[PDB]
């Protein structure tokens, strides 16, 4: 029911490159044609020099044509799966553009739900799992039905008995695979649970080696790895005695067919058997055509067996991708209005509900007014939706209710132009630029260096500049070039203060910071919260006396609205 | 290369199962070649003989060969797949034990410089691809070489100049095509792997920074260079799919040259025979059927590079020296601790922080020291030296008037039972999670201790048979904290180091644990390291420290006056 529905999804995706998946079917038919042409030419040559003892140079025309059939086959093979890659690249490129468009539009609220490592397996590993299905499986799934049928059609005019040995095994191969498939699927459910908890046993023990040492179990979990590896082998070797029986059935019928073709033709030339030929004595050339083509008959079905593993992983990777694209999403309405002025704005709210992308309401009915250019700290209990109001003002969360910015409803405001008057300082510092010089200039990358220096010392990011190796342009990538938490946060402050803003939001800037940086972060922000209307969510109740308004938020509601009285 | 030298010694433990899996690969390939070569000759020999030569021609022997070669082709491939996969799983056990025996003595220190996220997932993916050296590389390369040799030797009984051109061409592509294509696709293999991890870090920093990119308008132009990395990355995957196209097209042309040469040369004469007759098809059908031995060869050698890649990414990770060494003095753990560290000035590697500025404190047996310091104080670094994750420089730590270095690892781990801040669920049965502390504990003792701690919801159903960790009964914070304490109670060490026991717990659980600690860990020297001020009133001593220095010490009071 589901696995059938996922396969239908994989077909809907394979439409960008339907042109490239038709030339893999066409070149499969052409490559099939060239096998008979090769096989027929070789039989014509071989019969002439064996039976009629024709010299080498009188067969110079079939040799010249046999070379072409060999060069053409090599060209088609090179051409066939370059088309196959081009097909599979276009699904991966088009879907990865749909996934990113689904994440960019969903916003940071939906993105933050899962770790960024689990998002980058969806965009990298899940999508690249689907290449070898449109590139190698689907083209081969149709070369496995044309080439075997095209070979039999070529042999049938020669003999109806040599083309019946090959066509005789056509129903038997899937019939015997089903008989061995019952035993295999029995062992795939009995041993499925045990092999799911034994496959991740090594990484389980390999992680948490810090707990193994502190209790002295380092030498006693080597024995566990010895028993979890001897038990994973025994169970897999039970599954594999049946997975190599189904595979070896096709190898049984491809050698029975060659044995039968060789015996039937060999005995027919001697006179024991005379039923196959159409009342005309079977020729040597008619036996070489069938013997050369007997292995080529089963090769397409053999390759399909190797590429069939890509069928399963492209369906599993289509489960993660499909449900990702079928999750309903509530995202903020794209407005069209703009802000008349960059003068600090006035916030107003009445019976405001903030809706998660999941669909639930994080902050209940809350009403407040924030006059222009007045700091207002928002302190409350943990988990009470205090950070949700900051997201809703940034445009990351969709709200049903009334939230108007400077007299204009936030829904009508165009996000591209609303966020030109907005600045934010998050709790955890997230630097997305390559170099520390471009992180500060993230707001505008062409700002004058003289202005930049006035922004660097304002946030006191320059005091720890000499400690960094390269100075201002020190690489800040997360790997091997890091800064201190209180250092990568003081550069987030400089990024926020580089460009003046109408509304400035602070989401617990001084969290998990050393006491040295926390002093310099706050008094850099405590002077930056007066020029424009500021809405801060702080964990520390201390030293908020010089804050115009305090809102206490319990269970997503403004209960205690006071002035630190 | 030579990076495989330590790992080829693990394959030598099972060398008769790997050899049997290669001999069966040679036999299966010789049966495939023999079946078609005998079939090609049988058709030609009988057709030439015709009806007239029926009685003179002995067809029973060639008819038994095709039946014999067909059976050993099907049974040989079934048993070659079984024996070679079975030997692969046996070596996998030796690769895992070897990797785990090496990464264990450097578990806290050596792996700290890397990141635990990718490092631990890379080791599993590199051990898995070292295990496939035999199937992907050795079996196709050595199976083909012996098949080429036996075919060449066998065909030399008919004509010497024909066996050495079919064998010569076949050998000249077993040794030339794999290296000429590994060398041709070496830049792409480097370029593709670099661009894959470059797109990964540009995507993670685009997703994690989506809140700080959207506001400042860089979300569009930081995706534009993210999609330009993919364009470069996809162009380095096509160039790798054009080396597989060229290798399959060339292998089809070389197997075409051998067939055409056999049609031309063998028709001239086979073994000093003007009219070879049926011997033309024996050589032509040998050239046709001998090039599926060389089908795996060219993709096998590129796999050697990946195995070389993963054989050095582990052989430098497992060859870095342990930070500390434990002399096997065979000491005996005492019933009391009396921990004392005269002076400990310790500094991290590649860090000028020097978290311990030379601190000093003395703990008597039975005391309940409770070190207090705000975040970033390096207070947990003190608990690292006591378990000897790092040894201090110019420091003296004594344990019952004997230095911590003198104790062997077998006794140090039994002397000190630490509850870590991150407690790891082992994804095993709950009985196997707590027997980690004390292996000899009886089944009754497990239920009692798990009762006294307060984890009764675990023993309600399948208490010692339930599967905890991944794919099982996961535990929550504060319900997993009682597991860390439960293990420390089984371990029954005289000293108990607690690292933030109540870091993230609500009021009701934190109050229980503080009483849970004091009631049971009463006769045991306890050194508890927290940044919380609640339960210090029951501790016989409190140490208040900042930036690795003791400011307020000797305060038998509930907490630092200013801290209150």
Author numbering:
A (entry chain D): 4 to 568
B (entry chain C): 1 to 564
Paper text:
The ABC transporter CydDC plays a central role in the biogenesis of membrane-integrated and soluble cytochromes. Here, we used cellular, biochemical, structural and computational methods to characterize the structure and function of the heterodimeric bacterial ABC transporter CydDC. We provide multi-level evidence that CydDC is a heme transporter required for functional maturation of cytochrome bd, a pharmaceutically relevant drug target. Each subunit is composed of a membrane domain formed by six transmembrane α-helices (TMH), an N-terminal cytoplasmic elbow helix oriented parallel to the membrane plane and a cytoplasmic NBD.
Of the two constructed Walker B variants, only CydDCE500Q could be isolated in sufficient yield, purity and stability. The nucleotide and substrate-free, inward-facing conformation of CydDC IFasisolatedapo, obtained in as isolated conditions, exhibits canonical features of type IV ABC transporters. In contrast to the turnover dataset of CydDCE500Q, biochemically defined CydDCE500Q cryo-EM samples revealed conformational heterogeneity reflected by structures of IFasisolatedapo, IFconfinedheme and Occreturnapo states.
